[PDB]
Amino acid sequence: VGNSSGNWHCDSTWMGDRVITTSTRTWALPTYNNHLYKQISNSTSGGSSNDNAYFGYSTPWGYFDFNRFHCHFSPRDWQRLINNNWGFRPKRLSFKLFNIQVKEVTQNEGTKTIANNLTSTIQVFTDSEYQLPYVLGSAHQGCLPPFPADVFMIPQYGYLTLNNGSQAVGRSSFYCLEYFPSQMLRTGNNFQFTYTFEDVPFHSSYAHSQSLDRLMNPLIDQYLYYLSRTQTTGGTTNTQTLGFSQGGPNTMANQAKNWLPGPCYRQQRVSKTSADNNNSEYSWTGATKYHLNGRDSLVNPGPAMASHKDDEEKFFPQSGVLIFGKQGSEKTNVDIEKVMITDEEEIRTTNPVATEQYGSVSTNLQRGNRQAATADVNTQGVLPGMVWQDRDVYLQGPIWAKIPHTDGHFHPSPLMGGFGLKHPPPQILIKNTPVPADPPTTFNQSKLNSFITQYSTGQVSVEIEWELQKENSKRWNPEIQYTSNYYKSTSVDFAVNTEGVYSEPRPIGTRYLTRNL
Amino acid sequence: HSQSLDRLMNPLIDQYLYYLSRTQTTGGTTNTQTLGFSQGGPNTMANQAKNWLPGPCYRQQRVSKTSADNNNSEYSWTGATKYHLNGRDSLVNPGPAMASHKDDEEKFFPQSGVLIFGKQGSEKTNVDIEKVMITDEEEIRTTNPVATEQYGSVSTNLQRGNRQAATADVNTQGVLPGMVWQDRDVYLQGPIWAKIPHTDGHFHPSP
Amino acid sequence: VGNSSGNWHCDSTWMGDRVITTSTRTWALPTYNNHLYKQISNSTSGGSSNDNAYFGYSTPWGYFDFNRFHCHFSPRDWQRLINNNWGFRPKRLSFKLFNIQVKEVTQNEGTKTIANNLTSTIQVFTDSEYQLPYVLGSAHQGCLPPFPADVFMIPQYGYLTLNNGSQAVGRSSFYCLEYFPSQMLRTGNNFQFTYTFEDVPFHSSYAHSQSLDRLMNPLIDQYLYYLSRTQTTGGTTNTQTLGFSQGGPNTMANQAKNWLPGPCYRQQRVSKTSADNNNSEYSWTGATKYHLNGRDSLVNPGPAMASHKDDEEKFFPQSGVLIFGKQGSEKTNVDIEKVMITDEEEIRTTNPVATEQYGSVSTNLQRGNRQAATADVNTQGVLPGMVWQDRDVYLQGPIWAKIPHTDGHFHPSPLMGGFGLKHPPPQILIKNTPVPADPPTTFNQSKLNSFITQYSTGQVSVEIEWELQKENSKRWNPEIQYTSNYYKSTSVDFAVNTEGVYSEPRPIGTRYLTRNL
Ligand SMILES: O=S(=O)(O)OC[C@H]1O[C@@](COS(=O)(=O)O)(O[C@H]2O[C@H](COS(=O)(=O)O)[C@@H](OS(=O)(=O)O)[C@H](OS(=O)(=O)O)[C@H]2OS(=O)(=O)O)[C@@H](OS(=O)(=O)O)[C@@H]1OS(=O)(=O)O
Ligand SMILES: O=S(=O)(O)OC[C@H]1O[C@@](COS(=O)(=O)O)(O[C@H]2O[C@H](COS(=O)(=O)O)[C@@H](OS(=O)(=O)O)[C@H](OS(=O)(=O)O)[C@H]2OS(=O)(=O)O)[C@@H](OS(=O)(=O)O)[C@@H]1OS(=O)(=O)O
Ligand SMILES: O=S(=O)(O)OC[C@H]1O[C@@](COS(=O)(=O)O)(O[C@H]2O[C@H](COS(=O)(=O)O)[C@@H](OS(=O)(=O)O)[C@H](OS(=O)(=O)O)[C@H]2OS(=O)(=O)O)[C@@H](OS(=O)(=O)O)[C@@H]1OS(=O)(=O)O
Ligand SMILES: [Mg+2]
Ligand SMILES: [Mg+2]
Ligand SMILES: [Mg+2]
């Protein structure tokens, strides 16, 4: 009461191989469902079939949504990191929330007054054992303000279990966090905790110099031969002969390679222009999707892929990449004018193009009587001899994810890009102390529903330590860097419009530094 | 498991991420080629964004426990799921890495997908379903798809303003990063452990 | 004020042979009778005769009602305990109440406002010497919320003494707790105390494998004989002969046994269906009851008994077992549709059936001239050679009871099932500090009646340590366990309906593990 909790510590630092940063901001915490649980299943769906089936509840508590970058780093520093280091990973993390302030609110005749009620308190905790359904990683909105000065509110919390559409199987668990320890905290009382990561391969934040098809010297040839002559073009009697050749400095396509492009999944090629697209609603039909327990659904935000080939800016995977609406986007049918679609013209070195075919294989077995068939191959699996690179980062997006604690997993690198962990940073959940309004003078068997509408605020602290690998390359020529366009514009990039409301001009990736393959 | 791949995300919220929910413009009879987009609708959670993916799969032949539900042809060795090796073509089970069936499909089960255990007192051949104890896999319908079921659907070529947008079906599949599953169960009325082939190339040598 | 009192500690743990659990919840404390005592006798009865006579008072104070299980344990854990251990008992207990908040309330023109009055305080204590009428054990309602998230109010307190109906004997004591020490506690000031149990036989939480009648081997016989031939069926002259036999593997009923079924009391057999019951109001008349000082009354919730015999689901003792209305039950005449009657088809091994006769004995003395009489025996007493098992637990019910400090007691095992103690955990009583409203400017001889309507809240902590005995049996076959039905239902069991209000689908017992008799 007569003392503050903690100063405002929010900056960045570059000690070299490490880079510590934190973000101090403020929030607000409103009551929910009037401190009451709920059962939210497809009974509240109103339309969908065994496709959008969901069976869960709504806890009166709330959680934190800071799993992004543009909310942890500033624009410039991001630039700083990107244009300088090849790879990075998170090392340490901390959390502090303090300077809490509870304010009850009376509503006498539409004339409401907001007073302060320090007598109240709050309860919050962390799920270390990961017994609660990990929610983040789903990249729900309502993240920490990608901006510092602006404050926000913490989103309520709700989860889902196994369900048979409008109903649920017995194997549908049920949870209630109020069955856990919670740092009961009153105003004046601060709160902090500590977390640490584990080893994870640094997100390869770099672009390659060569390609799989072109990693071999040109001046030489391959002492190895190949079938370059099925028939004999010795006239009109092109019989069945067997001519062979070697690594032609010109026939480098027919040459010999030792590696192979990563796995793939065929997507539907759409375009940024309108007239280039057919005239049929295939958004949910001609789309690439999978099937699960009848509950058929999309197979993205992604796959492990690259958007398109050279000079195909117009076309992009239908559901292959990410989509980020500029500041001020509604919930539906907004136009391309608002969003910032993610171009993947960067991985066209290792990963194929989803909108594109993948390969072509033998259909049966050619012979002197029956013709030689050549089948096409759009979809594929993985095999030894395949190498690729997962999705990029896009600070205007997720930062890390949650690995499903199961037995069978493979290269658990996220499909929304980022980092995966078998033991990820916990989930932070909070609620306002249930202040029972005026109780009946005489006894009653039932429970209390009456309360006092109240909420609180405070400062969110998060120290994220970081690891990095800087470019040590001898690339003689000036590689490419990322920089705000050096010309004169009306509203500076990442600047605050004359109304304080600022946005991001464009999305940003990492694969910039030309790292030799 | 308590949840599913498709439903591991909160419902109360949405995804600040958008997706292609409007190929054409239902603005009348002139449904041109437009580009409407949406976000993680608490209702459109199917079209929502997910980060993981169902384990690998292999299409099986869906049979049934009842008789009249099965066609009338001997496909036990023909319409069956099998592989090929040095001409020595053979079945591809007792199994694959899979789940038997979807919800309320007790009647149907993979033809050769799961295990079969005859109750005490079973001869060597043609015994009936009355004796054996077929293994129901209505448990992994959370991570692993259904062998008797299709797996996915992918783009066939490349739609365009003149040529229609094709959508090919995908029964068989391979593995990729972003896939997670769970091998077969135990069944104490069955094997306890196995033997890994001492070779060089092996992967998730789970039996 | 500038500090909270104690975190929210409420979970379960299984260290093995012990299991500690606690429940953190919140409550509310309203004033009562305006801080005034009362004399409640059959003067406020309005109807009843020397049958429902009561002479007591109403203290302005309140007490705690947490003597149940479903309010101390969660559903799953209960399952955990039951399906795993044969027997258990309580070992240690603690209590903490804090984060108090007093809120006065003004009422200006129907326009009331609830402010905070930290200046106030509260007074609460514990009765160790057991000088106050033990109230719990009577299983009054208003228990701790069998649920965690929901908060409640503490029930007022009132007791009763010896009375002659509408009046009371001089031997009718009088009590006033305000004549005891009370931890005067102001907000910000926490409160805690400590308690420990004493030795008590673990509630035999198990079902038997055999029966009294069938605990003997079948392959053999008994070298002992018995009277199996009164007359001689040697024709039409069935004289008086004396044939004898031994333990026939078929005549095992006539065989020899060494033990005997526990005591009994005849109940009225009713049924769950309607047409099976006669058409007469015997609810209070044809009922099993006792007599005391003219004050005739029922003889239950129970006796020491088993509900019914095999396949008699329809019939159950009229007043023999317990009754628990599902969530949302009024006070009277509700139907069977709401309650959850307790089936006792479990003790049909040791304890007879109350609705059933008990035995049959000789009436006089048969002889060659006078016929042999055989009287029936419905009611019984106890004798050496009798063994039984008291009532079950039913977590949707009481947890322990209070033994009457007297001289003559026997197998003080509760009739409402549970545990009995000669020195049970104390009773917790609280009240709000009497805040005398505006006193007259000039003097007055009389006392002050004017006050300020106010109340408070806080968190109830209760650490209950537990002892257990796990199944070590070599029962080759899979014994039976308790589990939620593995099918698909609309509303999951013990789940929160889509309105937060959750209930219990069915009652639960312990005698599950097949323990060899
Ligand atoms: O054994 S394989 O089926 O894999 O094929 C190699 C040999 O099979 C043939 C003929 O079959 S045989 O009975 O095994 O000797 O298969 C090819 O032709 C058969 C029928 O043809 S034939 O005219 O009698 O020779 C067709 O089918 S089937 O045998 O699988 O039922 C196949 O063709 S088709 O595309 O359906 O028209 C074809 O085999 S396959 O489908 O490609 O596997 C002979 O094939 S051949 O080389 O094309 O002539 C092979 O034997 S051969 O006599 O040495 O040619
Ligand atoms: O290069 S691709 O084959 O991958 O396709 C894109 C462009 O190829 C076309 C035409 O070919 S071109 O000679 O490369 O310019 O392919 C599409 O049409 C060709 C023949 O068509 S056309 O009427 O002359 O335009 C067909 O085959 S082939 O070129 O592969 O031999 C294909 O269609 S079909 O399904 O067999 O009928 C079709 O290509 S594909 O099979 O889908 O790959 C043009 O295609 S188009 O966009 O559909 O018109 C593309 O060039 S374009 O002139 O810009 O359209
Ligand atoms: O001593 S007992 O009463 O316990 O019984 C055994 C002997 O008593 C009798 C006769 O009584 S005596 O005066 O003690 O000798 O009792 C039985 O008969 C008497 C009267 O009967 S009798 O015809 O004169 O023999 C009845 O009553 S009473 O004596 O108790 O007043 C009893 O019967 S009844 O059910 O009321 O009809 C009956 O005795 S009891 O009630 O069963 O106890 C003789 O009884 S007998 O064996 O049935 O004949 C016994 O003496 S005996 O002469 O050896 O038979
Ligand atoms: Mg063939
Ligand atoms: Mg083609
Ligand atoms: Mg007599």
mmCIF file with all atom_site columns, C-alpha atoms in Angstrom, chain A residues 406-409, chain B residues 95-98 144 181-185 192-197 202-207:
data_model
loop_
_atom_site.group_PDB
_atom_site.id
_atom_site.type_symbol
_atom_site.label_atom_id
_atom_site.label_alt_id
_atom_site.label_comp_id
_atom_site.label_asym_id
_atom_site.label_entity_id
_atom_site.label_seq_id
_atom_site.pdbx_PDB_ins_code
_atom_site.Cartn_x
_atom_site.Cartn_y
_atom_site.Cartn_z
_atom_site.occupancy
_atom_site.B_iso_or_equiv
_atom_site.pdbx_formal_charge
_atom_site.auth_seq_id
_atom_site.auth_comp_id
_atom_site.auth_asym_id
_atom_site.auth_atom_id
_atom_site.pdbx_PDB_model_num
ATOM 1  C CA . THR A 1 406 ? 3.152  -38.819 -26.969 1.00 0.00 ? 406 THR A CA 1
ATOM 2  C CA . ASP A 1 407 ? 5.482  -41.630 -28.004 1.00 0.00 ? 407 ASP A CA 1
ATOM 3  C CA . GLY A 1 408 ? 5.732  -41.317 -31.753 1.00 0.00 ? 408 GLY A CA 1
ATOM 4  C CA . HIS A 1 409 ? 6.938  -37.962 -32.975 1.00 0.00 ? 409 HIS A CA 1
ATOM 5  C CA . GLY B 2 95  ? -0.841 -54.355 -38.917 1.00 0.00 ? 95  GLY B CA 1
ATOM 6  C CA . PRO B 2 96  ? 0.405  -50.847 -39.956 1.00 0.00 ? 96  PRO B CA 1
ATOM 7  C CA . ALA B 2 97  ? 0.629  -47.919 -37.564 1.00 0.00 ? 97  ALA B CA 1
ATOM 8  C CA . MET B 2 98  ? -3.109 -47.362 -37.228 1.00 0.00 ? 98  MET B CA 1
ATOM 9  C CA . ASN B 2 144 ? -3.925 -41.966 -35.656 1.00 0.00 ? 144 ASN B CA 1
ATOM 10 C CA . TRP B 2 181 ? 1.158  -40.807 -33.285 1.00 0.00 ? 181 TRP B CA 1
ATOM 11 C CA . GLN B 2 182 ? 1.111  -43.801 -30.957 1.00 0.00 ? 182 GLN B CA 1
ATOM 12 C CA . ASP B 2 183 ? 1.983  -47.367 -31.910 1.00 0.00 ? 183 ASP B CA 1
ATOM 13 C CA . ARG B 2 184 ? -0.309 -50.362 -31.354 1.00 0.00 ? 184 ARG B CA 1
ATOM 14 C CA . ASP B 2 185 ? -1.609 -51.373 -27.918 1.00 0.00 ? 185 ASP B CA 1
ATOM 15 C CA . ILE B 2 192 ? 5.131  -58.871 -25.010 1.00 0.00 ? 192 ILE B CA 1
ATOM 16 C CA . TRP B 2 193 ? 8.217  -57.678 -26.886 1.00 0.00 ? 193 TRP B CA 1
ATOM 17 C CA . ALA B 2 194 ? 9.941  -58.219 -30.220 1.00 0.00 ? 194 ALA B CA 1
ATOM 18 C CA . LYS B 2 195 ? 13.288 -58.418 -31.988 1.00 0.00 ? 195 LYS B CA 1
ATOM 19 C CA . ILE B 2 196 ? 14.828 -55.559 -33.908 1.00 0.00 ? 196 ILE B CA 1
ATOM 20 C CA . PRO B 2 197 ? 16.604 -56.582 -37.137 1.00 0.00 ? 197 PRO B CA 1
ATOM 21 C CA . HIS B 2 202 ? 15.673 -48.442 -39.103 1.00 0.00 ? 202 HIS B CA 1
ATOM 22 C CA . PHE B 2 203 ? 13.153 -45.923 -37.908 1.00 0.00 ? 203 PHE B CA 1
ATOM 23 C CA . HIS B 2 204 ? 11.075 -45.744 -34.760 1.00 0.00 ? 204 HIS B CA 1
ATOM 24 C CA . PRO B 2 205 ? 11.604 -49.533 -34.468 1.00 0.00 ? 205 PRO B CA 1
ATOM 25 C CA . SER B 2 206 ? 8.413  -49.682 -32.444 1.00 0.00 ? 206 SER B CA 1
ATOM 26 C CA . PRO B 2 207 ? 6.813  -53.079 -33.263 1.00 0.00 ? 207 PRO B CA 1
#
